[PDB]
Design a binder for this molecule. Structure first.
Ligand SMILES: Nc1nc2c(ncn2[C@@H]2O[C@H](COP(=O)(O)OP(=O)(O)O)[C@@H](O)[C@H]2O)c(=O)[nH]1
Ligand SMILES: Nc1nc(NCc2ccc3c(c2)OCO3)cc(-c2cccc3[nH]ccc23)n1
Ligand SMILES: Nc1nc(NCc2ccc3c(c2)OCO3)cc(-c2cccc3[nH]ccc23)n1
Ligand SMILES: [Ca+2]
Ligand SMILES: [Mg+2]
Lengths: 422, 59
Protein backbone atom coordinates (compact mmCIF):
# COMPACT_ATOMS: atom_id res chain seq x y z
CA UNK A 1 0.00 0.00 0.00
CA UNK A 2 3.18 2.11 -0.21
CA UNK A 3 2.42 4.41 2.74
CA UNK A 4 4.43 7.58 3.44
CA UNK A 5 4.65 9.11 6.93
CA UNK A 6 4.95 12.91 6.99
CA UNK A 7 6.57 14.91 9.79
CA UNK A 8 6.67 18.71 10.13
CA UNK A 9 8.74 20.28 12.91
CA UNK A 10 8.86 23.86 14.16
CA UNK A 11 7.42 27.11 12.87
CA UNK A 12 8.74 26.99 9.30
CA UNK A 13 8.26 23.25 8.98
CA UNK A 14 4.66 23.41 10.15
CA UNK A 15 3.63 26.39 8.01
CA UNK A 16 5.07 24.90 4.82
CA UNK A 17 3.70 21.49 5.85
CA UNK A 18 0.24 22.98 6.24
CA UNK A 19 0.40 24.57 2.79
CA UNK A 20 1.53 21.22 1.37
CA UNK A 21 -1.45 19.43 2.93
CA UNK A 22 -3.99 22.02 1.83
CA UNK A 23 -2.63 21.97 -1.75
CA UNK A 24 -2.50 18.19 -2.14
CA UNK A 25 -5.81 17.74 -0.30
CA UNK A 26 -7.28 20.03 -2.94
CA UNK A 27 -5.69 17.95 -5.71
CA UNK A 28 -7.17 14.74 -4.26
CA UNK A 29 -10.61 16.30 -3.73
CA UNK A 30 -10.49 16.09 0.08
CA UNK A 31 -12.26 18.91 1.92
CA UNK A 32 -11.32 20.29 5.37
CA UNK A 33 -13.55 17.73 7.10
CA UNK A 34 -11.74 14.88 5.32
CA UNK A 35 -14.58 13.98 2.92
CA UNK A 36 -13.99 13.19 -0.75
CA UNK A 37 -15.92 15.45 -3.12
CA UNK A 38 -14.01 14.96 -6.37
CA UNK A 39 -15.03 13.93 -9.86
CA UNK A 40 -12.56 11.19 -10.82
CA UNK A 41 -11.39 7.88 -9.36
CA UNK A 42 -7.78 8.73 -10.26
CA UNK A 43 -7.89 11.19 -7.36
CA UNK A 44 -8.57 8.37 -4.95
CA UNK A 45 -6.67 5.65 -6.81
CA UNK A 46 -3.39 6.27 -4.93
CA UNK A 47 -4.81 8.36 -2.06
CA UNK A 48 -3.47 5.96 0.56
CA UNK A 49 0.13 7.11 -0.05
CA UNK A 50 -0.46 10.21 2.11
CA UNK A 51 -3.92 9.64 3.66
CA UNK A 52 -5.31 7.03 6.05
CA UNK A 53 -8.86 5.77 5.61
CA UNK A 54 -11.02 6.21 8.73
CA UNK A 55 -14.38 4.79 9.79
CA UNK A 56 -16.54 7.77 8.81
CA UNK A 57 -15.11 7.18 5.33
CA UNK A 58 -12.79 10.03 6.26
CA UNK A 59 -9.32 10.47 4.78
CA UNK A 60 -6.87 11.73 7.40
CA UNK A 61 -3.33 12.87 6.50
CA UNK A 62 -0.56 10.55 7.70
CA UNK A 63 1.01 13.56 9.34
CA UNK A 64 2.77 14.28 12.63
CA UNK A 65 3.01 17.85 13.90
CA UNK A 66 5.91 18.75 16.19
CA UNK A 67 7.07 21.92 17.92
CA UNK A 68 8.65 22.90 21.22
CA UNK A 69 6.19 25.82 21.53
CA UNK A 70 2.39 25.80 21.10
CA UNK A 71 1.84 28.96 19.03
CA UNK A 72 2.18 27.54 15.54
CA UNK A 73 0.10 24.42 16.23
CA UNK A 74 -2.78 26.54 17.50
CA UNK A 75 -2.39 28.49 14.26
CA UNK A 76 -2.44 25.19 12.32
CA UNK A 77 -5.60 24.01 14.10
CA UNK A 78 -7.27 27.32 13.24
CA UNK A 79 -5.92 27.28 9.67
CA UNK A 80 -8.28 26.46 6.79
CA UNK A 81 -7.61 22.68 6.69
CA UNK A 82 -6.72 22.43 10.37
CA UNK A 83 -9.55 20.05 11.28
CA UNK A 84 -8.29 17.39 8.87
CA UNK A 85 -5.24 16.51 10.97
CA UNK A 86 -5.47 13.79 13.59
CA UNK A 87 -5.62 15.43 17.06
CA UNK A 88 -3.32 12.79 18.57
CA UNK A 89 -0.71 13.66 15.94
CA UNK A 90 -0.10 17.09 17.52
CA UNK A 91 2.95 16.69 19.77
CA UNK A 92 4.11 19.95 21.35
CA UNK A 93 6.12 21.04 24.38
CA UNK A 94 5.92 24.37 26.17
CA UNK A 95 9.48 25.67 26.50
CA UNK A 96 10.36 26.74 22.96
CA UNK A 97 13.89 26.45 21.61
CA UNK A 98 14.92 30.09 21.27
CA UNK A 99 16.40 29.63 17.79
CA UNK A 100 19.00 27.42 19.49
CA UNK A 101 20.02 24.15 17.81
CA UNK A 102 21.46 22.86 21.08
CA UNK A 103 18.11 23.34 22.79
CA UNK A 104 16.37 21.52 19.92
CA UNK A 105 18.85 18.64 19.71
CA UNK A 106 20.22 18.07 23.24
CA UNK A 107 18.16 19.65 26.05
CA UNK A 108 14.59 20.83 25.43
CA UNK A 109 14.13 18.57 22.38
CA UNK A 110 15.32 15.33 23.97
CA UNK A 111 12.55 15.50 26.57
CA UNK A 112 9.91 15.48 23.78
CA UNK A 113 11.51 13.21 21.16
CA UNK A 114 10.25 9.92 22.68
CA UNK A 115 6.64 11.06 22.59
CA UNK A 116 7.10 12.08 18.96
CA UNK A 117 8.56 8.65 18.10
CA UNK A 118 5.62 6.90 19.80
CA UNK A 119 3.21 8.57 17.38
CA UNK A 120 5.49 7.78 14.43
CA UNK A 121 5.43 4.13 15.53
CA UNK A 122 1.65 4.10 15.89
CA UNK A 123 1.26 5.44 12.33
CA UNK A 124 3.87 3.04 10.88
CA UNK A 125 2.38 0.01 12.67
CA UNK A 126 -0.89 0.43 10.77
CA UNK A 127 0.88 0.89 7.43
CA UNK A 128 0.34 -1.93 4.95
CA UNK A 129 3.92 -1.36 3.69
CA UNK A 130 5.65 1.83 4.87
CA UNK A 131 7.95 3.12 2.13
CA UNK A 132 9.47 5.86 4.31
CA UNK A 133 9.36 9.37 5.68
CA UNK A 134 9.30 13.00 4.64
CA UNK A 135 10.15 15.84 7.03
CA UNK A 136 9.47 19.56 6.53
CA UNK A 137 11.57 21.98 8.57
CA UNK A 138 13.94 24.92 8.45
CA UNK A 139 17.63 24.63 9.32
CA UNK A 140 18.04 28.15 10.74
CA UNK A 141 15.93 27.93 13.90
CA UNK A 142 16.08 25.62 16.87
CA UNK A 143 13.19 23.16 16.79
CA UNK A 144 12.97 22.22 13.13
CA UNK A 145 16.75 22.28 12.88
CA UNK A 146 17.92 20.71 16.13
CA UNK A 147 14.97 18.59 17.13
CA UNK A 148 14.23 17.72 13.48
CA UNK A 149 17.70 16.29 13.00
CA UNK A 150 17.38 14.50 16.34
CA UNK A 151 14.11 12.94 15.10
CA UNK A 152 15.80 12.00 11.82
CA UNK A 153 18.61 10.28 13.73
CA UNK A 154 16.16 8.30 15.88
CA UNK A 155 14.07 7.30 12.86
CA UNK A 156 17.23 6.09 11.13
CA UNK A 157 18.08 4.06 14.21
CA UNK A 158 14.65 2.37 14.38
CA UNK A 159 13.93 2.17 10.60
CA UNK A 160 17.44 1.93 9.16
CA UNK A 161 16.36 0.54 5.76
CA UNK A 162 13.58 3.07 5.11
CA UNK A 163 13.95 6.16 2.98
CA UNK A 164 14.23 9.44 4.89
CA UNK A 165 13.46 12.50 2.77
CA UNK A 166 13.44 16.13 3.85
CA UNK A 167 12.27 19.43 2.45
CA UNK A 168 14.78 21.69 4.21
CA UNK A 169 14.55 25.49 4.19
CA UNK A 170 18.11 26.88 4.17
CA UNK A 171 18.78 30.26 5.82
CA UNK A 172 19.97 33.44 4.08
CA UNK A 173 20.99 36.82 5.55
CA UNK A 174 18.48 38.41 3.12
CA UNK A 175 15.60 36.77 5.04
CA UNK A 176 16.93 36.32 8.54
CA UNK A 177 15.44 36.00 12.03
CA UNK A 178 18.61 35.69 14.10
CA UNK A 179 22.38 36.01 13.70
CA UNK A 180 22.90 32.40 14.84
CA UNK A 181 21.23 30.86 11.78
CA UNK A 182 24.52 29.78 10.15
CA UNK A 183 25.47 27.86 13.30
CA UNK A 184 22.14 26.08 13.38
CA UNK A 185 22.39 25.41 9.66
CA UNK A 186 25.94 24.06 9.74
CA UNK A 187 25.16 21.70 12.59
CA UNK A 188 22.07 20.43 10.73
CA UNK A 189 23.63 19.85 7.30
CA UNK A 190 26.11 17.41 8.87
CA UNK A 191 23.16 15.44 10.23
CA UNK A 192 21.42 15.43 6.88
CA UNK A 193 24.63 14.27 5.21
CA UNK A 194 24.60 11.22 7.44
CA UNK A 195 20.95 10.35 7.91
CA UNK A 196 18.83 11.33 4.88
CA UNK A 197 18.49 9.80 1.44
CA UNK A 198 17.22 12.99 -0.24
CA UNK A 199 17.15 16.61 0.86
CA UNK A 200 15.47 19.34 -1.17
CA UNK A 201 17.45 22.53 -0.56
CA UNK A 202 14.86 25.31 -0.41
CA UNK A 203 16.74 28.61 0.03
CA UNK A 204 14.80 31.56 1.45
CA UNK A 205 17.17 33.79 -0.54
CA UNK A 206 15.94 32.27 -3.81
CA UNK A 207 12.29 32.31 -2.75
CA UNK A 208 12.68 36.00 -1.92
CA UNK A 209 14.34 36.85 -5.23
CA UNK A 210 11.55 35.01 -7.07
CA UNK A 211 8.76 36.80 -5.19
CA UNK A 212 10.50 40.18 -5.64
CA UNK A 213 12.08 40.15 -9.09
CA UNK A 214 9.87 37.77 -11.03
CA UNK A 215 6.50 37.97 -9.27
CA UNK A 216 6.88 41.76 -8.69
CA UNK A 217 5.91 41.58 -4.98
CA UNK A 218 7.48 44.58 -3.21
CA UNK A 219 7.04 43.24 0.35
CA UNK A 220 6.98 39.41 0.24
CA UNK A 221 5.69 37.61 3.32
CA UNK A 222 6.37 34.08 4.55
CA UNK A 223 2.99 33.23 3.05
CA UNK A 224 4.27 34.22 -0.38
CA UNK A 225 7.43 32.09 0.02
CA UNK A 226 5.48 29.11 1.32
CA UNK A 227 3.12 29.28 -1.67
CA UNK A 228 6.14 28.52 -3.88
CA UNK A 229 7.34 25.83 -1.50
CA UNK A 230 3.98 24.04 -1.40
CA UNK A 231 3.60 24.18 -5.20
CA UNK A 232 7.09 22.73 -5.60
CA UNK A 233 6.41 19.94 -3.09
CA UNK A 234 3.12 19.11 -4.84
CA UNK A 235 5.05 18.87 -8.08
CA UNK A 236 7.73 16.64 -6.60
CA UNK A 237 5.20 14.20 -5.10
CA UNK A 238 2.96 14.08 -8.19
CA UNK A 239 4.70 11.06 -9.71
CA UNK A 240 3.69 8.91 -6.73
CA UNK A 241 0.33 10.51 -5.89
CA UNK A 242 -1.45 10.02 -9.17
CA UNK A 243 -2.09 7.10 -11.55
CA UNK A 244 0.21 6.75 -14.53
CA UNK A 245 2.97 4.73 -16.12
CA UNK A 246 5.54 4.58 -13.31
CA UNK A 247 5.87 1.79 -10.72
CA UNK A 248 8.01 3.60 -8.21
CA UNK A 249 8.54 3.92 -4.48
CA UNK A 250 10.81 6.30 -2.64
CA UNK A 251 13.67 3.80 -2.79
CA UNK A 252 13.55 3.34 -6.57
CA UNK A 253 13.48 7.14 -6.99
CA UNK A 254 16.43 7.51 -4.59
CA UNK A 255 18.39 4.79 -6.42
CA UNK A 256 17.80 6.60 -9.70
CA UNK A 257 18.70 10.07 -8.35
CA UNK A 258 21.55 9.61 -5.83
CA UNK A 259 24.86 8.35 -7.29
CA UNK A 260 26.92 8.88 -4.09
CA UNK A 261 25.50 8.58 -0.59
CA UNK A 262 26.60 11.99 0.74
CA UNK A 263 25.68 13.93 -2.44
CA UNK A 264 21.90 13.85 -2.03
CA UNK A 265 21.02 17.57 -1.88
CA UNK A 266 18.71 18.61 -4.73
CA UNK A 267 17.92 21.97 -6.29
CA UNK A 268 14.16 22.22 -6.89
CA UNK A 269 12.54 24.41 -9.52
CA UNK A 270 9.06 25.28 -10.74
CA UNK A 271 7.52 26.70 -13.93
CA UNK A 272 5.62 28.74 -14.75
CA UNK A 273 6.17 31.39 -12.08
CA UNK A 274 -1.24 35.61 -16.00
CA UNK A 275 -3.47 33.89 -18.55
CA UNK A 276 -1.27 33.18 -21.60
CA UNK A 277 -1.05 29.41 -22.01
CA UNK A 278 2.55 28.20 -21.82
CA UNK A 279 3.96 26.22 -24.73
CA UNK A 280 6.18 23.21 -24.07
CA UNK A 281 9.28 25.12 -25.25
CA UNK A 282 8.44 27.84 -22.70
CA UNK A 283 7.95 25.40 -19.79
CA UNK A 284 11.17 23.60 -20.70
CA UNK A 285 13.30 26.73 -21.07
CA UNK A 286 11.98 28.26 -17.83
CA UNK A 287 12.32 25.12 -15.67
CA UNK A 288 16.04 25.01 -16.47
CA UNK A 289 16.50 28.74 -15.93
CA UNK A 290 18.55 29.73 -12.85
CA UNK A 291 15.75 32.19 -12.07
CA UNK A 292 13.33 29.31 -11.44
CA UNK A 293 15.68 27.49 -9.05
CA UNK A 294 14.77 27.49 -5.35
CA UNK A 295 18.33 26.97 -3.97
CA UNK A 296 19.92 30.27 -5.03
CA UNK A 297 22.75 28.55 -6.96
CA UNK A 298 23.86 29.13 -10.53
CA UNK A 299 23.63 25.75 -12.31
CA UNK A 300 26.05 27.04 -14.95
CA UNK A 301 28.73 27.00 -12.17
CA UNK A 302 28.59 23.23 -11.81
CA UNK A 303 27.42 20.02 -13.46
CA UNK A 304 24.29 17.90 -13.21
CA UNK A 305 24.79 14.45 -11.76
CA UNK A 306 21.12 13.67 -12.32
CA UNK A 307 17.91 15.47 -13.26
CA UNK A 308 14.22 14.61 -12.93
CA UNK A 309 11.62 16.71 -14.78
CA UNK A 310 7.90 16.28 -13.95
CA UNK A 311 5.33 17.78 -16.33
CA UNK A 312 1.69 18.17 -15.29
CA UNK A 313 -1.24 18.80 -17.63
CA UNK A 314 -2.52 17.62 -21.00
CA UNK A 315 0.28 17.98 -23.57
CA UNK A 316 2.16 16.11 -26.28
CA UNK A 317 4.60 13.58 -24.84
CA UNK A 318 6.31 13.74 -28.24
CA UNK A 319 6.77 17.49 -27.83
CA UNK A 320 8.01 17.04 -24.25
CA UNK A 321 10.61 14.49 -25.38
CA UNK A 322 11.73 16.72 -28.22
CA UNK A 323 12.20 19.77 -25.98
CA UNK A 324 13.94 17.85 -23.19
CA UNK A 325 16.30 16.34 -25.75
CA UNK A 326 16.88 19.82 -27.21
CA UNK A 327 17.96 21.26 -23.86
CA UNK A 328 20.24 18.28 -23.14
CA UNK A 329 21.85 18.26 -26.60
CA UNK A 330 22.40 22.02 -26.75
CA UNK A 331 23.75 22.23 -23.17
CA UNK A 332 25.61 18.92 -23.01
CA UNK A 333 28.65 20.30 -21.17
CA UNK A 334 26.62 20.93 -17.98
CA UNK A 335 25.62 17.21 -17.73
CA UNK A 336 28.28 14.74 -16.62
CA UNK A 337 29.32 12.50 -19.51
CA UNK A 338 30.01 9.53 -17.18
CA UNK A 339 26.37 8.98 -16.17
CA UNK A 340 24.55 8.11 -19.42
CA UNK A 341 20.89 9.03 -19.76
CA UNK A 342 20.92 10.98 -16.52
CA UNK A 343 17.86 13.14 -17.41
CA UNK A 344 14.53 11.44 -16.62
CA UNK A 345 11.06 12.75 -17.49
CA UNK A 346 7.66 12.04 -15.95
CA UNK A 347 4.25 13.22 -17.16
CA UNK A 348 1.12 13.35 -15.02
CA UNK A 349 -2.17 14.10 -16.79
CA UNK A 350 -3.67 15.97 -13.81
CA UNK A 351 -2.56 19.64 -13.58
CA UNK A 352 -2.38 21.63 -10.34
CA UNK A 353 -5.08 24.08 -9.35
CA UNK A 354 -5.29 27.08 -11.70
CA UNK A 355 -2.36 26.36 -14.01
CA UNK A 356 -3.12 24.46 -17.23
CA UNK A 357 0.46 23.24 -17.64
CA UNK A 358 3.35 23.11 -15.22
CA UNK A 359 6.80 21.64 -14.71
CA UNK A 360 8.70 20.80 -11.53
CA UNK A 361 12.47 20.36 -11.66
CA UNK A 362 14.70 18.25 -9.39
CA UNK A 363 18.42 18.60 -10.06
CA UNK A 364 21.30 16.81 -8.35
CA UNK A 365 23.91 19.41 -9.34
CA UNK A 366 27.43 19.99 -8.06
CA UNK A 367 26.58 23.72 -8.10
CA UNK A 368 24.77 23.16 -4.79
CA UNK A 369 28.22 23.51 -3.22
CA UNK A 370 27.75 27.26 -3.58
CA UNK A 371 25.00 27.16 -0.98
CA UNK A 372 27.15 25.28 1.49
CA UNK A 373 30.09 27.57 0.82
CA UNK A 374 27.88 30.53 1.63
CA UNK A 375 26.85 29.03 4.96
CA UNK A 376 30.40 27.97 5.75
CA UNK A 377 31.68 31.51 5.26
CA UNK A 378 29.07 32.97 7.55
CA UNK A 379 29.85 30.25 10.06
CA UNK A 380 33.56 30.94 9.95
CA UNK A 381 33.11 34.71 10.17
CA UNK A 382 31.53 34.20 13.58
CA UNK A 383 33.28 31.06 14.75
CA UNK A 384 36.80 32.49 14.29
CA UNK A 385 35.83 35.01 17.00
CA UNK A 386 33.60 32.55 18.92
CA UNK A 387 30.76 35.08 18.63
CA UNK A 388 27.44 33.98 20.18
CA UNK A 389 28.99 30.68 21.18
CA UNK A 390 27.95 31.08 24.84
CA UNK A 391 24.32 30.43 23.81
CA UNK A 392 25.43 26.91 22.79
CA UNK A 393 28.15 26.02 25.30
CA UNK A 394 25.66 27.02 28.00
CA UNK A 395 23.51 24.11 26.80
CA UNK A 396 26.50 21.76 27.11
CA UNK A 397 28.03 21.86 23.64
CA UNK A 398 31.79 22.09 23.29
CA UNK A 399 33.69 24.20 20.76
CA UNK A 400 35.01 20.88 19.43
CA UNK A 401 31.58 19.96 18.06
CA UNK A 402 31.47 23.19 16.06
CA UNK A 403 34.94 22.57 14.64
CA UNK A 404 33.85 19.08 13.54
CA UNK A 405 30.62 20.37 11.94
CA UNK A 406 32.59 23.03 10.03
CA UNK A 407 35.02 20.34 8.86
CA UNK A 408 32.24 18.00 7.73
CA UNK A 409 30.76 20.77 5.59
CA UNK A 410 34.06 21.77 4.01
CA UNK A 411 34.52 18.09 3.14
CA UNK A 412 31.06 17.97 1.54
CA UNK A 413 32.09 20.99 -0.55
CA UNK A 414 35.36 19.27 -1.55
CA UNK A 415 33.45 16.16 -2.65
CA UNK A 416 31.12 18.20 -4.85
CA UNK A 417 34.20 19.84 -6.38
CA UNK A 418 35.87 16.50 -7.06
CA UNK A 419 32.89 15.35 -9.09
CA UNK A 420 32.48 18.70 -10.85
CA UNK A 421 35.98 18.58 -12.32
CA UNK A 422 35.84 14.86 -13.24
CA UNK B 1 22.83 17.17 28.64
CA UNK B 2 24.85 16.04 31.68
CA UNK B 3 27.52 18.67 31.00
CA UNK B 4 24.85 21.34 30.87
CA UNK B 5 23.33 20.22 34.18
CA UNK B 6 26.80 20.16 35.76
CA UNK B 7 27.67 23.67 34.57
CA UNK B 8 24.40 25.08 35.92
CA UNK B 9 24.99 23.38 39.28
CA UNK B 10 28.59 24.61 39.44
CA UNK B 11 27.42 28.17 38.81
CA UNK B 12 24.87 27.85 41.63
CA UNK B 13 27.48 26.26 43.92
CA UNK B 14 30.18 28.85 43.29
CA UNK B 15 27.81 31.78 43.70
CA UNK B 16 26.48 30.33 46.96
CA UNK B 17 29.99 29.85 48.36
CA UNK B 18 31.16 33.29 47.19
CA UNK B 19 28.16 35.04 48.72
CA UNK B 20 28.49 33.19 52.04
CA UNK B 21 32.21 33.98 52.24
CA UNK B 22 31.55 37.66 51.53
CA UNK B 23 28.77 37.97 54.10
CA UNK B 24 30.86 36.26 56.80
CA UNK B 25 33.91 38.41 56.05
CA UNK B 26 31.71 41.52 56.19
CA UNK B 27 30.15 40.53 59.50
CA UNK B 28 33.57 39.95 61.06
CA UNK B 29 34.93 43.28 59.78
CA UNK B 30 31.94 45.31 60.98
CA UNK B 31 31.97 43.71 64.42
CA UNK B 32 35.72 44.39 64.69
CA UNK B 33 35.24 48.08 63.85
CA UNK B 34 32.57 48.46 66.53
CA UNK B 35 34.65 46.52 69.06
CA UNK B 36 37.64 48.80 68.46
CA UNK B 37 35.49 51.92 68.90
CA UNK B 38 33.96 50.61 72.14
CA UNK B 39 37.45 49.64 73.35
CA UNK B 40 38.60 53.24 72.81
CA UNK B 41 35.59 54.49 74.77
CA UNK B 42 36.37 52.05 77.59
CA UNK B 43 39.94 53.37 77.63
CA UNK B 44 38.35 56.80 78.05
CA UNK B 45 36.24 55.58 80.98
CA UNK B 46 39.39 54.10 82.57
CA UNK B 47 41.23 57.40 82.10
CA UNK B 48 38.28 59.32 83.61
CA UNK B 49 38.46 57.04 86.66
CA UNK B 50 42.20 57.62 87.04
CA UNK B 51 41.45 61.36 86.83
CA UNK B 52 38.80 61.21 89.54
CA UNK B 53 41.21 59.22 91.71
CA UNK B 54 44.15 61.59 91.17
CA UNK B 55 41.72 64.36 92.23
CA UNK B 56 40.60 62.43 95.33
CA UNK B 57 44.20 61.58 96.36
CA UNK B 58 45.25 65.20 95.87
CA UNK B 59 43.15 66.28 98.87
N1 LIG C 1 10.42 29.89 3.81
C1 LIG C 1 10.05 30.04 5.11
N2 LIG C 1 11.01 30.22 6.04
C2 LIG C 1 10.69 30.38 7.35
C3 LIG C 1 9.29 30.36 7.76
N3 LIG C 1 9.27 30.54 9.09
C4 LIG C 1 10.56 30.67 9.51
N4 LIG C 1 11.40 30.59 8.46
C5 LIG C 1 12.87 30.63 8.47
O1 LIG C 1 13.31 29.64 9.39
C6 LIG C 1 14.34 30.18 10.22
C7 LIG C 1 13.75 30.31 11.62
O2 LIG C 1 13.39 29.00 12.01
P1 LIG C 1 11.97 28.67 12.68
O3 LIG C 1 11.15 27.68 11.89
O4 LIG C 1 11.18 29.93 12.95
O5 LIG C 1 12.57 28.05 14.03
P2 LIG C 1 11.88 26.85 14.84
O6 LIG C 1 10.38 26.90 14.64
O7 LIG C 1 12.26 26.99 16.31
O8 LIG C 1 12.42 25.56 14.29
C8 LIG C 1 14.71 31.52 9.64
O9 LIG C 1 15.74 31.29 8.68
C9 LIG C 1 13.45 31.95 8.93
O10 LIG C 1 13.79 32.77 7.81
C10 LIG C 1 8.29 30.16 6.68
O11 LIG C 1 7.07 30.13 6.94
N5 LIG C 1 8.74 30.01 5.42
N1 LIG D 1 21.98 7.06 6.33
C1 LIG D 1 23.01 6.16 6.40
N2 LIG D 1 22.81 5.00 5.71
C2 LIG D 1 23.82 4.10 5.77
N3 LIG D 1 23.61 2.91 5.03
C3 LIG D 1 24.28 1.62 5.08
C4 LIG D 1 23.37 0.42 5.29
C5 LIG D 1 23.73 -0.88 4.94
C6 LIG D 1 22.90 -2.00 5.17
C7 LIG D 1 21.68 -1.77 5.76
C8 LIG D 1 21.30 -0.46 6.12
C9 LIG D 1 22.11 0.62 5.90
O1 LIG D 1 20.04 -0.53 6.69
C10 LIG D 1 19.82 -1.91 7.00
O2 LIG D 1 20.68 -2.64 6.11
C11 LIG D 1 25.04 4.39 6.52
C12 LIG D 1 25.12 5.63 7.22
C13 LIG D 1 26.30 6.13 8.03
C14 LIG D 1 26.53 7.50 8.00
C15 LIG D 1 27.60 8.12 8.70
C16 LIG D 1 28.49 7.41 9.45
C17 LIG D 1 28.29 6.03 9.51
N4 LIG D 1 29.02 5.08 10.19
C18 LIG D 1 28.45 3.82 9.96
C19 LIG D 1 27.34 3.97 9.12
C20 LIG D 1 27.20 5.37 8.81
N5 LIG D 1 24.11 6.55 7.15
N1 LIG E 1 14.07 11.20 -6.06
C1 LIG E 1 12.79 11.70 -6.23
N2 LIG E 1 12.43 12.08 -7.52
C2 LIG E 1 11.16 12.56 -7.67
N3 LIG E 1 10.75 13.00 -8.98
C3 LIG E 1 10.02 12.28 -10.09
C4 LIG E 1 10.64 11.06 -10.78
C5 LIG E 1 9.93 10.35 -11.75
C6 LIG E 1 10.42 9.22 -12.42
C7 LIG E 1 11.68 8.81 -12.09
C8 LIG E 1 12.43 9.50 -11.12
C9 LIG E 1 11.95 10.61 -10.46
O1 LIG E 1 13.65 8.86 -10.99
C10 LIG E 1 13.56 7.65 -11.74
O2 LIG E 1 12.40 7.75 -12.57
C11 LIG E 1 10.31 12.69 -6.52
C12 LIG E 1 10.79 12.27 -5.25
C13 LIG E 1 10.04 12.35 -3.96
C14 LIG E 1 10.76 12.85 -2.88
C15 LIG E 1 10.21 12.99 -1.59
C16 LIG E 1 8.92 12.64 -1.32
C17 LIG E 1 8.17 12.14 -2.38
N4 LIG E 1 6.86 11.71 -2.37
C18 LIG E 1 6.53 11.30 -3.66
C19 LIG E 1 7.64 11.45 -4.49
C20 LIG E 1 8.71 11.98 -3.70
N5 LIG E 1 12.03 11.77 -5.07
CA1 LIG F 1 13.21 21.21 30.21
MG1 LIG G 1 11.62 31.79 14.29
Amino acid sequence: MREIVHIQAGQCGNQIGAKFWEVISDEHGIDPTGSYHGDSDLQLERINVYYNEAAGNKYVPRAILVDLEPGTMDSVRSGPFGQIFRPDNFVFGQSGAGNNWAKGHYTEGAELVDSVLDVVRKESESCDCLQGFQLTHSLGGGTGSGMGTLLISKIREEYPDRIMNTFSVVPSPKVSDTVVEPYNATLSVHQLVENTDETYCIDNEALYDICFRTLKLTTPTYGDLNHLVSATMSGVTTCLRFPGQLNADLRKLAVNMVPFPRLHFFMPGFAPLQYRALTVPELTQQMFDAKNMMAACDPRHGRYLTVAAVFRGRMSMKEVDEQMLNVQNKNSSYFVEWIPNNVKTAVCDIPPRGLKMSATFIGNSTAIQELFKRISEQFTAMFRRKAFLHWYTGEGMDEMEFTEAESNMNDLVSEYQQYQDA
Amino acid sequence: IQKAIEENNNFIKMAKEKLAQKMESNKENREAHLAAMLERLQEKDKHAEEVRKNKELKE
